[PDB]
Amino acid sequence: VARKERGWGTVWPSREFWHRLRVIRTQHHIEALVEHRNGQVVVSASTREWAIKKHLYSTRNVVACESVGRVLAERCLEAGINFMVYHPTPWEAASDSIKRLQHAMTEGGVVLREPRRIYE
Amino acid sequence: DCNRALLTRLHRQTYARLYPVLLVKQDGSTIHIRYREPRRMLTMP
Amino acid sequence: SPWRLLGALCLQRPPLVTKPLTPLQEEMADLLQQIEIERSLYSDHELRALDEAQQLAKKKSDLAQDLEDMWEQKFLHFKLGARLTEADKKDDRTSLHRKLDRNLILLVREKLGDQDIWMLPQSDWQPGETLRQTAERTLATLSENNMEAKFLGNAPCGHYKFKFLGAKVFFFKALLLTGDFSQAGKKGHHVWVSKEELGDYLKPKYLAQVRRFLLDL
Amino acid sequence: RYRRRAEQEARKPHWWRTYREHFGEESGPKDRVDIGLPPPKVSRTQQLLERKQALRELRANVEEERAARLQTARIPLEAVRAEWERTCGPYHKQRLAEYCGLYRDLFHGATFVPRVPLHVAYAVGEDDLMPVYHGNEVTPTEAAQAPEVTYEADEGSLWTLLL
Amino acid sequence: YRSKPTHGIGRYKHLVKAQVRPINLGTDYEYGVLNIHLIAYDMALAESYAQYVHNLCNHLAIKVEESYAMPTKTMEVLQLQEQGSKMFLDAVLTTHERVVQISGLSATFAEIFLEIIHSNLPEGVKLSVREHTEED
């Protein structure tokens, strides 16, 4: 029932959501954040993190993206947030690493594409 | 430094088979040309 | 502060024949070969080889090899120039024909009145002259030879000062096209030498830093 | 690259009227009265060395690289969850609590990092166990009975639990 | 708004411009508009070295303007046959040309550059330096 932020739409991405998945790819590490429109990061999984770093190999690999996705799904469920928006770039949509990140996130039980507003 | 760019493949999508050929111009000098014909040598008068 | 004016020259011989390949470059060469022929489209020779290999099998029950063997024998019969004109001699550092693979540089021997000099060829320029003109002049004059050497810039390569007075040594780069050495058996000692050997024969710290602007290849 | 640079620029405190200003960064800069347990004291250099070593060893294996190129690998999630609980977990739990305004309604100004992990669960049946993580959803049916509580301390200790 | 302190904050167009002589001063001496002709019999080789040149230039901050291919010249080689006295036989060859234009240089950078270019020359590769005026 709450208010999303309708608007912008001269610019990108859409700022309309309660929660937004944000995937940053450094030439070294893959970092997946879940954000609230406040800019505040709510729950995140990074490859700089020792927990994830030590178990696996090649921080920048496709493998790593898949991994971070699974971790994030887990922590998301644990945090009580089942829905978030993901707004990739057209060429990030075609990339394997991110397709498999989305897959990992889906099997984890987190739905992208948030529910609509009521009496929007 | 002469081997710098020496190692490459032809990058065009659809192309014939290219085979190593030893070409002698009029020197006494020999070069390596990739040519469709399997012939191991050719020489110019 | 009196300034002693001395031009100087770094004389570069062009490497003639290409080097052999590092093991890695060799394996890589193999790979590139394999994949190149893997993505390749047919061949005219292989069209006439395979199509006839099958069509003759169909004309028996109901060329290419000729060409192969011809080219085999025409290649095998022919013989090629030696890659080593150095190590068969194995002696001469003074031969301009010595090393085919690397680039070579000229050294000279001089014993002066107060001094013992192993010398990268040097010039002496009067204030009215240009360092360029003096470089060329000294080159053509000293070696007693007819040399076509294309110079690169009007700017000098590298500089080293000995101050007793004060003095300058300005080294220039000259690219040798075709030299003709007159009196190949002359007494003045001219040594044609690679990078490692340039490291060996050179005593001074003025000539020690020439391998700093040299092309190591 | 542009997008990045821009988002960094949008996080700085400019001198002109901005979105952050009107839309409630929620007190903006805040000096935090901290009622915590003191952070565990661990040697920087030693830890660094050990980790470097571990990663050397892990990178060394050919098996691992095979696992990487062929896109077949898995992470032992339970162990990652253990390590996370042990290491940076307290901070993440903290910012979740901040997000849900635990600190705002309890101590009013005060932030603490949850140094000791707290494991709470409910019995839904004989074989069923419903965990309470930070922020998770639970049905009152599940919570009809008092939960099982677990955390690690030796005993000279005295504690107080509050729901 | 003109009256405000924040005026022209959104001003951009001066940052992006969307709308030949060599300079020889004798001290700071800029000799530009130079043509690099890489000519060889093998396609792959010529392209590869052209590539190396291009990348090298981009790394050395030397500004490349146009990189393009020149028309290939088709050679028909007539070899003498011994049996028939004046009889001719034939073999077909092709000459490939690539071009890299550099817009600026200094004496020192010219000297350095040429060193690097000719040092790294592959076998069967003919190199040329010329001036911008050429007719296609």
Next chain:
Amino acid sequence: IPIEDFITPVKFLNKERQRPPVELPFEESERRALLLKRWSLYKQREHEMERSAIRSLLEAQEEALQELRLSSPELHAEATKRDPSLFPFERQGPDYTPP
């Protein structure tokens, strides 16, 4: 008046059928890939020593030219200018067999 050779010739169209098969085991695959990574590392070190080389050369140019300016001003009047001798620079690459 442009005419490019980048175009694919007509001869190459329907003769495609000559090279359908390609297959590798675990062996050739992993070998080629390993080799490729190895090769990238190698090429990197190569580019590195190359750049360090040209950098050292350029530093020799700095010390040199600056030395000549500090000694005689007339000499960096002379040598800082680029000569007309460099217009048609032509050089031939090495060969396999000497003449």
Next chain:
RNA sequence: GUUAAUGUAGCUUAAUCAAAGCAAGGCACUGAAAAUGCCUAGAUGAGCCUCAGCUCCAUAAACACCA
């Protein structure tokens, strides 16, 4: 041998979750670049000590020196 400084990867982070970001490389993709995709290598100058201190080494900037 003397003074003002230092030694993070090529340039700049951090040193209470942690050695971070950017350059730079390879292969694929189109003619070259570029973008993009899949990949690659990396550091707290070296020796001890207390849980910042003592030297060494080396660079650098000068001076002295040496030729």
